[PDB]
Amino acid sequence: MSVSDGNGPITFGSNYSDEAPKAAFASLMQQATTSTTVPVTVNTTDHNTFQNNISNYLQGTPDSLATWFAGYRLQFFAAQGLLTPIDDVWDKIGGTFNDAAKSLSKGLDGHYYLVPLYNYPWVVFYNKSVFQSKGYEVPASWEAFIALARKMQSDGLVPLAFADKDGWPALGTFDILNLRINGYDYHIKLMKHEVPWTDPGVTKVFDQWRELAAYQQKGANGRTWQDAAKALENKQAGMMFQGSNQVAANYSAKNLPDLDFFVFPAINPQYGTDYMDAPTDGFILPKKGKNAAAAKKVLQYIGTAEAEAAFLKTDHWDVGLANGLIAPTYNDIQKKSVAEIGKCKSVSQFMDKDTVPDMANAMIKLIQQFIDQPTPETIATVQKSAEDQAKTIFR
């Protein structure tokens, strides 16, 4: 049945269980119903349960459409035949999105499976008043970054506020170093365990982190990320690398206007600053779902700048993927997020969505082990353990 022939009710499996996004999604689907004349029913499930249960959900009697996100699981579901391809939807909406947005929405088979809605950046935050007062420039390269971090220490500042008591924050540093040194394709190969954790490329990541760590706040494994963000906000540290919906979210309204960011500096010209973790949420069409053609009409409505701006009205950190869209509700962090994310050649999804959850979990303690003892002997141990556990996790 042609997209334009699609009519009648659809259901929508939604993991938007928290009050704010639940409300925003209900409102968007009401608008979609009115615009498309496809009546949309939203079936909400507890957020964790929806993602824990996804493989069974998709194998049983799923809804016509569902909330999901880019990364390892999306691609596996496609290969399993659990998702309906939506090349026809993308014939209509493809002009709205860049090649990076297209890539994260596609299988290896070259077909589209996802319609993305929004994402947010992992970047290096700083206070503008401090850069201005102290005479710091944004560093574009590794050599400039290190020189700036030494100047910050000369001025009595911790260069990078840094925390890993929470376990996941340090995974971002592993990601961004891998992306800068080895590139996106290599990073994804490692996350999929096509390349082993004992690979020399991983050694290179840790070796570079040995130098970075000299400028990273001491005592990191005992520090919450909110306490690191507060060190930035109180001007005790010069910079902090993390997700905007963490660092910027933690700032008081009074200090927010001083907050800015830059992308993690380039390490070599091969990969420049081409890549970033920017966790991207969107929508899929379950193969066993009912009324595919109507479901595609609703996806077409969702894959617009208009839908993005409506949904994000009350969202302070996420930004739409529509090419260059600046929504009237965006604050300055979101504006710069659109600018920087949009320049990326590919965007990765953070380690916990690019590998399988079990492997991301495994890496938490191993990276903590590194941070406590960042030596060549520790790196060998970490690589060996990581690969041992990977050989069990990946089947």
**Pair 90, 230 in one domain:** no
**Pair 241, 291 in one domain:** no
**Residue (of 172, 158, 167) closest to 234 by Cα position:** 158
Q: What is the DSSP string of 231-297?
A: HHHTTSEEEEEEEHHHHHHHS-TTTGGGEEEEPPPBS-TTTTT-EEE---EEEE-BTTSS-HHHHHH
Q: Dihedral sign, CA of 122, 301, 71, 13?
A: positive
Q: What is the CATH number of the domain that holds 74?
A: 3.40.190.10
| Distance separating alpha carbons of residues 346 and 247, to the nearest angstrom | 23
Burial code of 59-90, b = ≥16 C-beta within 10 A, e = fewer? eeebbbbbbbbbbbbbbebbeeebbbbbeebb
| Distance separating alpha carbons of residues 52 and 268, to the nearest angstrom | 39
**Pair 270, 368 in one domain:** yes
In eight-state DSSP terms, residue 265 is P
| Distance separating alpha carbons of residues 344 and 339, to the nearest angstrom | 9
Tokens of 184: 């996106």
| Distance separating alpha carbons of residues 29 and 124, to the nearest angstrom | 35
CB 239 within 8 A of CB 311: no
| Distance separating alpha carbons of residues 203 and 282, to the nearest angstrom | 34
In the PDB record, what is the listed experimental method? X-ray
**Domain stop point among 337, 356, 387:** 337
With both helix axes pointing from N to C terminus, report the angle between 171-181 and 184-191 in degrees, rounded to the nearest 10: 130
**Pair 217, 348 in one domain:** yes
**Pair 273, 290 in one domain:** no
| Distance separating alpha carbons of residues 392 and 160, to the nearest angstrom | 35
User: Strand order of the sheet with strand 259-262?
Assistant: 158-161, 237-243, 122-127, 259-262
Residue range of the domain that includes 125 = 121-278+338-395
φ, ψ for residue 291, nearest 5 deg: 60, 55
In the block, residue with structure tokens 């000369």: 154
3-state secondary structure of 204: helix
Cα(first)–Cα(last) distance of the chain, in Å?
A: 39
3-state secondary structure of 152: helix
CB 341 within 8 A of CB 278: yes
**Pair 273, 154 in one domain:** yes
C-alpha atoms less than 13 angstroms from C-alpha of 47 in its C-beta half-sphere = 8
Give the contacts of 225 (CB within 8 A, at least 6 positions apart). Answer: 163, 165, 166, 169, 242, 246
Q: Where are the beta strands (DSSP E) in the chain?
A: 10-14, 40-44, 65-69, 114-119, 122-127, 158-161, 237-243, 259-262, 275-277, 281-284, 319-320, 346-348
- Ramachandran region, residue 380 (left: φ > 0; alpha: ψ -120 to 50; beta: rest): alpha
Q: How many CB atoms are closer than 10 A to CB 31?
A: 16
- 158-161 and 275-277 strand pairing: unpaired
Burial code of 293-327, b = ≥16 C-beta within 10 A, e = fewer? bbbbbbbbbbbbbebbbbbbeebbbbbbbbeebeb
**Pair 46, 152 in one domain:** no
**Domain stop point among 337, 352, 383:** 337
Burial class (CB in 10 A: 0-12, 13-18, 19+), 155: middle
| Distance separating alpha carbons of residues 173 and 239, to the nearest angstrom | 14
Tokens of 390: 């990977």
φ, ψ for residue 275, nearest 5 deg: -125, 155
Tokens of 39: 């009546």
Beta partners for residue 216, in sequence order = 160
In the block, residue with structure tokens 């066993």: 288
Resolution, Å (one decimal): 1.8
**Pair 103, 33 in one domain:** yes
Q: Into how many domains does the chain fold?
A: 2
φ, ψ for residue 144, nearest 5 deg: -70, -35
Q: What amino acid occupies position 261?
A: F
3-state secondary structure of 83: strand
Q: What is the DSSP string of 322-333?
A: STT---TT--HH
| Distance separating alpha carbons of residues 341 and 322, to the nearest angstrom | 11
**Pair 394, 309 in one domain:** no
| Distance separating alpha carbons of residues 26 and 24, to the nearest angstrom | 6
Q: What amino acid occupies position 133?
A: S
| Distance separating alpha carbons of residues 66 and 63, to the nearest angstrom | 7
**Pair 134, 105 in one domain:** no
**Residue (of 321, 325, 313, 331) closest to 260 by Cα position:** 331
**Pair 49, 30 in one domain:** yes
**Pair 374, 265 in one domain:** yes
Burial code of 251-288, b = ≥16 C-beta within 10 A, e = fewer? beeeebebbbbbbbbbbeeebebbbbbbbbbbbbbbbb
In the block, residue with structure tokens 């420039």: 137
**Residue (of 124, 98, 112) closest to 277 by Cα position:** 124
Q: What amino acid occupies position 61?
A: T
Burial class (CB in 10 A: 0-12, 13-18, 19+), 208: middle
